[PDB]
């Protein structure tokens, strides 16, 4: 039950469905036409953050420019959140871990050593906590925009407090839009949830060129590789 698995054949997905789940089998089969491998994340309610965090940092091993951009945005993000009302003493430890992971990528760590960091519960969860805070900060900052996404009567802040900041509260489109804008990154998600064997790609933000590909299924975000 690792936090982030080794690189696996797409066919491992067949195990996660009943023999009779004919439509999910057809989607898995179609996915083989587009992707080659998958890395599973533990299905614990943190999957989007964890999958995004690993996939993006792994991608930055191959793009020194993007690595420096990401580091700069990430460094600044702490003061940003503090200026907006997130307590510094509370969030400093999480930010320090996030920056240490970035440093690991800057030092040209192997994927194996990056993976080992993501499989340390404290290290990996500190990254997730930070990503959740970044996402909450962006939603709150652009609350007038995001208001319409929120069903039921809660304010954007109340939504953030109950559905984004807490560990184990799995992500949907609201999280993804906000985190992509927060870090100015581009995320493709294959939704395996559509018409036939079709999984339906969504790119966040629309119009961008993604370097992270994720697979959504109810209760899972996994990392896909072409």
Curated annotation (Swiss-Prot):
It comes from the Eukaryota. Residues 145-151, 170-177, 200-206 are annotated as: Free ubiquitin binding. Its main location: cytoplasm. The keyword Coiled coil does not apply. The keyword Metal-binding does not apply. GO terms for biological process: adaptive immune response; DNA damage response; DNA repair; negative regulation of double-strand break repair; positive regulation of TORC1 signaling; protein deubiquitination; protein K48-linked deubiquitination; proteolysis. It catalyses: Thiol-dependent hydrolysis of ester, thioester, amide, peptide and isopeptide bonds formed by the C-terminal Gly of ubiquitin (a 76-residue protein attached to proteins as an intracellular targeting signal). Its EC number is 3.4.19.12. Changing residue 44 to A: Abolished ability to deubiquitinate DEPTOR. Does not affect ability to deubiquitinate RPTOR. It is found in: Cytoplasm. One of its GO terms (cellular component) is extracellular exosome. The record marks 177, 191, 193, 216, 221 as: Interacts with free ubiquitin. Belongs to the peptidase C65 family. This is Ubiquitin thioesterase OTUB1. It comes from Homo sapiens (Human). The gene is OTUB1. The chain holds residues 45 to 271 of 271 of the full protein.
